[PDB]
């Protein structure tokens, strides 16, 4: 009786939101950006190849200086690379080799990683002893760690396969806030540029917008047909893009509270592993299971170019803070640095 | 390299590269095995001499100059197809089936089919274990095998009943290139390490023959 009545009210609320979104869907992003000229063909060459990982690379993250990056592989090694010289700055042996994510702190003093061990491990890069040591192991998730991002040296947000995201106080080792509401495994998260909000994509084919300070879900974005594997904020923080197993990328708007554009091709039938934006946000770069990275026109949903330099899945990618280059990690154990030429 | 500090930085990088190769060579000498099965199928005590080294439970032991790393993924209650590709480079899969549990028998059959026909385990061999065969023989007297398998029409003897269950699992394999090593074991059996070693040795030879170009 009471349960049946309540679940009917949820359907009415869902229709109310759907009608509300349809009311503000006056135009389409495709119609708005029809007049602007296309970006042309985007040609990028492999400037650097980072060799030394002996297993599948699962994650990479640039440092804020746009020169150092950290990559994680299931050879049980965290490696920090000097991308300008291809020098290895550090090699961090992981206690658990089943790593799925890695993060570089914006200060550059810490890196984080974690996987099927359900732990987010914090590593101190600047110690008086001259070696990288574990500074914190964040326990509390009951599923695998899928993504992690530093807010500062003391706070980090983690998403897990136990359907929850958490905000952690690194100094105390406790999760100050728990973000619940996803009905599937949360596979990725992206921080807003001001680090007041973050979006997460789960296996329920939905993207939720969370308030870091308040600790509740502000908005829920649906439209994908399969598990979301990747998510990335637009550079101004007013939009985000997702990548799913349905071979599509979608651009959702925070303020319009709905999808604006879909990035898919008939030839593309493989899942998407990673998404990132260029510095101006005009390009959306997505890594795919078909061993390729497709560069999309974010505004016009046109495939601008292809980065074909890997013999296995493109598992991760990232664009530097200065926008100079893009790194692609792959299951073939190599990292490549790409940019164009005049 | 031109700068004095860059030369020492390059030397540090080269020293790191050397240690990465040394670790990788020692890592490639281990036999990694993925342990799967029902919730209670005897996978916890599949080997007596093995010792543990919510998350993934890794168990390792050494048998006849070969190091085996057994990974139990039963603690991961999340979606399996989001992290099962992490074991794509596994030497073999150890699948445990309890013959004394008819309720979970059909659970194992559908679990076996997904793993056997998984897109990441096409060329991965399976070491099927049918545990509690002594309890199955004791319980086959009062409870016929037709209770769990209505289509079963063979004799109710223990030897044929156990063989029919084994043939059910091997029928799930649709790839001729995959080899399944079935074994009937008891609770008091103490040669499960030898069975794994014999099966892994056969798999290694097939891998070596591919490595030497004969295949």
């Amino acid at each position, epitope marked *: 009786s009471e349960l049946d009545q309540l679940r009917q009210e949820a359907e009415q609320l869902k229709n109310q939101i759907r009608d509300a979104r349809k009311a503000c869907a006056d135009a389409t992003l495709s119609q708005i950006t029809n007049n602007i000229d296309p970006v042309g063909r985007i040609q990028m060459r492999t400037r650097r190849t980072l060799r030394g990982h002996l297993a599948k690379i699962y994650a990479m993250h640039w440092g804020t200086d746009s*020169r*150092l990056l950290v990559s994680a592989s299931q050879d049980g090694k965290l490696i920090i690379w*000097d991308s300008y*010289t291809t*020098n290895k*700055v*550090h090699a961090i042996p992981l206690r658990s080799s089943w790593v799925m994510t890695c993060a570089y702190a914006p200060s*550059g003093n810490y890196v984080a990683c974690g996987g099927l061990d359900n732990i987010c491990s914090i590593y101190n890069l*600047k110690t*008086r*002893e*001259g*070696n990288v040591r574990v500074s914190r192991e964040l326990a509390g998730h009951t599923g695998y760690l899928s993504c992690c991002r530093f807010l500062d040296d003391n706070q980090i947000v983690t998403s897990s396969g136990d359907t929850t995201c958490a905000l952690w106080d690194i100094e105390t080792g406790q999760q100050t806030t728990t973000f619940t509401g996803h009905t599937g495994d949360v596979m990725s998260l992206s921080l807003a540029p001001d680090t007041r909000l973050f979006v997460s994509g789960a296996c329920d084919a939905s993207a939720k917008l969370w308030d870091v300070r308040e600790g509740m879900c502000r908005q829920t974005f649906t439209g994908h047909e399969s598990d979301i594997n990747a998510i990335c904020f637009f550079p101004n923080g007013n939009a985000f893009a997702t990548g799913s197993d349905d071979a599509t990328c979608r651009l959702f708007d925070l303020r319009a509270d709905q999808e604006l554009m879909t990035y898919s091709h008939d030839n593309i039938i493989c899942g998407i592993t990673s998404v990132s934006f260029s510095k101006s946000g005009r390009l959306l770069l997505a890594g795919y299971d078909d061993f390729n990275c497709n560069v999309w026109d974010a505004l016009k949903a046109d495939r601008a170019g292809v980065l074909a330099g890997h013999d296995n899945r493109v598992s991760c990618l990232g664009v530097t803070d200065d926008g100079m280059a893009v790194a692609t990690g792959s299951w073939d154990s190599f990292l490549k640095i790409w940019n164009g030429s005049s | 390299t*031109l*700068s*004095a*500090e*860059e*030369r*020492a*930085a390059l*030397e*540090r990088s080269k*020293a790191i590269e050397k240690n990465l190769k040394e670790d990788g060579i020692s890592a490639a000498k281990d036999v990694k095995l993925l342990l799967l099965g029902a919730d209670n199928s005897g996978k916890s005590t599949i080997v007596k001499q093995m010792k543990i080294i919510t998350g993934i439970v890794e168990t390792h032991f050494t048998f006849k100059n070969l190091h085996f790393r057994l990974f139990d993924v039963g603690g991961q209650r999340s979606e399996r197809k989001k992290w099962i590709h992490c074991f794509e480079d596994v030497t073999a899969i150890i699948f445990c089936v309890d013959l004394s549990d008819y309720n979970r028998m059909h659970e194992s059959l559908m679990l076996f089919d997904s793993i056997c026909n998984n897109k990441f385990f096409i060329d991965t061999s399976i070491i099927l274990f049918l545990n509690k065969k002594d309890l199955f023989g004791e319980k086959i007297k009062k409870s016929p095998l037709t209770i769990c398998f209505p289509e079963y029409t063979g004799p109710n003897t223990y030897e044929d009943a156990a063989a029919y269950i084994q043939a059910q699992f091997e029928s799930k394999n649709r790839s001729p290139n995959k080899e399944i090593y079935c074994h009937m074991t008891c609770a008091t059996d103490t040669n499960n390490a030898q069975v794994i070693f014999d099966a892994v040795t056969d798999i290694i030879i097939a891998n070596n023959l591919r490595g030497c170009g004969l295949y």
Partner: single-chain antibody, 230 residues
Framework: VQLVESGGGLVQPGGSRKLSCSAS????????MHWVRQAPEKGLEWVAY????????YYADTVKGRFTISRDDPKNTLFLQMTSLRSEDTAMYYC??????????????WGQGTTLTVSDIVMTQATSSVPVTPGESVSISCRSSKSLLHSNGNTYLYWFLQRPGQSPQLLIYRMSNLASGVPDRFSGSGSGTAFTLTISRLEAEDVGVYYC?????????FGAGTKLEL
């Protein structure tokens, strides 16, 4: 982090002496090691260098062929075998750790030193002494015969402070960066061959001799040193 030197003492001319540097509290095998000596009432003088992994070894010309530098990584001990000792070798010998990777701070920790008594880019610090008062801003100048700015953007100039009775401490590395544990009042500014160390709101602790060292190429050379007095 500790670096204790031993083996120094009064030796006869033409003799031999073995200096040891025991390291504790840090990953010794990860750090390159230098020997730097300081003659009594004189400035710092670099002696030798052994890299991490013992693959690269450098000597100063005044000691090359007579001194041998070696390390024992399992025992965390640094050695300096000296032969044919001359009266020019009478100095306090310091054990200095230095690690080299992108963004590292070489020469960050120095040992207490051991005293031995026997019976090239030019770095110039013309101002030998500077009278100072607490709370007032002070600038110290250093010059080099060659440009210390490399094509990679680094300017390999270092600043050290040796308080009376104490070992040198790193203040500024690569001409602008502030060493860990150093107050923000110190600031390093330079261009090409001319460099300035600015000390805003001088305090009692800042009193001492300041040395500028170049790390552009070997041999590493020190300036004469500028002393601050009240």
């Amino acid at each position: 982090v500790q670096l204790v030197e031993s083996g120094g003492g009064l030796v006869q001319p033409g003799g031999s002496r073995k200096l040891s540097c025991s390291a504790s509290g840090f990953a010794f095998s990860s750090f390159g090691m230098h020997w730097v000596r300081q003659a009594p009432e004189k400035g710092l003088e670099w002696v030798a260098y052994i890299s991490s992994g013992s693959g690269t070894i450098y000597y100063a010309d005044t000691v090359k062929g007579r001194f041998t530098i070696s390390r024992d990584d399992p025992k965390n001990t640094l050695f300096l075998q000296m032969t044919s000792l001359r009266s020019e070798d009478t100095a306090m010998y310091y054990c200095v750790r230095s690690i080299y990777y992108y963004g590292s701070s070489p020469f960050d920790f120095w040992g207490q030193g051991t005293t031995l008594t026997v019976s090239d880019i030019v770095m110039t610090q013309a101002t030998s002494s500077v009278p100072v008062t607490p709370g007032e801003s002070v600038s110290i100048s250093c010059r080099s015969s060659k440009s210390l700015l490399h094509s990679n953007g680094n300017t390999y100039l270092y600043w050290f402070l040796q308080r009376p009775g104490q070992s040198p401490q790193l203040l500024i590395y690569r001409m602008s960066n502030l060493a860990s544990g150093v107050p923000d009042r110190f600031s390093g500014s330079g261009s090409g061959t001319a460099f300035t160390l600015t000390i805003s709101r001088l305090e009692a602790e800042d009193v001492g001799v300041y040395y500028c060292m170049q790390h552009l190429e070997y041999p590493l050379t020190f300036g004469a040193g500028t002393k601050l007095e009240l």
